[PDB]
Design a binder for this molecule. Structure first.
Ligand code: Q1G
Length: 304
């Protein structure tokens, strides 16, 4: 048993490296961000271009959807985040406060809050309605590589190149747990598991790990790919078989069996580092995006 992801569409149009791709929660759309300072919206099932969203004055590292699929937030080298109305393309709010590049962002499940992480080593929590910063967390001592809310929104997980993963209480801003590795490889990505009990963490020693953050115990390790430089997204695939999905610096998409940790598929098609992957919420569809020598997004579909 293995998935059989096959290339269905190639999505071209960005003029520089693509930095992130995300499927909307309602399954209809894909959003992409790029070093060309643009956001593009595409049909999730047919890859059809829908619109370009513009406004940032430097490149964009990350984009994220609100839970009702109506808003996007983007994180830019221009030190701001921007909240967007997707249907109109209008910038609703510009979130100012970080003192250097903003690298990562996410809405909470109710989507009344935004979390961000920056080169300035802080994590900020923002009010969507007013656009104002509610909390500044002194989260790390190196740039923040990822931020993510758990399934109910009571917790935030952050990661950094200082080598730490930290769990934060959303309401109070307190640090509830710090995950430490004696070899201390830079942590380049983290996110909560679908059931909220685990975190998946990428380190720049070509390794992904599944952690029980409450116990500080590593349950699973996934290797075989290449990741020593970039902050590459990783995913849990919940629509068919239980797979882990990640990009790689050898230009492939890697898919692992969650439980056995074996590689089950490698997706060949991109011509530069696959920096970002995303999994469709209801169908067995993967989106992948690559860096400057490629500049495209690819949609892959599987029977399981
Ligand atoms: N091995 C393994 C374990 C496992 C097995 C089965 C699971 O469902 C989960 N929960 S999870 O990690 O949140 C999850 C991952 C994927 Br991919 C899909 C759905 C989903 O609930 C976790 C951890 C030790 C047993």
């Amino acid at each position: 048993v293995k998935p059989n992801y096959a290339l269905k569409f190639t999505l071209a149009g960005h003029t520089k490296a693509v930095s992130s791709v995300k499927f909307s929660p309602n399954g209809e759309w894909l959003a992409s961000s790029s070093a060309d300072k643009l956001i593009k919206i595409w049909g999730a099932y047919d890859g059809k271009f829908e619109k370009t969203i513009s406004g940032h004055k430097l490149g964009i590292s990350d984009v994220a959807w609100s839970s009702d699929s109506n808003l996007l937030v983007s994180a830019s080298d221009d030190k701001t985040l921007k909240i967007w109305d997707v249907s109109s393309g209008k910038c609703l709010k510009t979130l100012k406060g970080h003192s250097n590049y903003v690298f990562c962002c996410n809405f909470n499940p109710q989507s009344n809050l935004i979390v961000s992480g920056s080169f300035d080593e802080s994590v900020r929590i923002w009010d969507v309605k007013t656009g104002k910063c509610l909390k500044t967390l002194p989260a790390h001592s190196d740039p923040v590589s990822a931020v993510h809310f758990n399934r109910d929104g009571s917790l935030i997980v952050s990661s950094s190149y200082d080598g730490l993963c930290r769990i934060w209480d959303t309401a109070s801003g307190q640090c509830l747990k710090t995950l430490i590795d004696d070899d201390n490889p830079p942590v380049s990505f983290v996110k909560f598991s679908p059931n909220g009990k685990y975190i998946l963490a990428a380190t720049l020693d070509n390794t992904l790990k599944l952690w029980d953050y409450s116990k500080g115990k590593c349950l699973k390790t996934y290797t075989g790919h290449k990741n020593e430089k970039y902050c590459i997204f990783a995913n849990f695939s919940v629509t068919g078989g239980k797979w882990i999905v990640s990009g790689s610096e050898d230009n492939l998409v890697y898919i692992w069996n969650l439980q056995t940790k074996e590689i089950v598929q490698k997706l060949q098609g991109h011509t530069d580092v696959v920096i970002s992957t995303a999994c469709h919420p209801t169908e067995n569809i993967i989106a992948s995006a690559a860096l400057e020598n490629d500049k495209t997004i690819k949609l892959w579909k599987s029977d399981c």
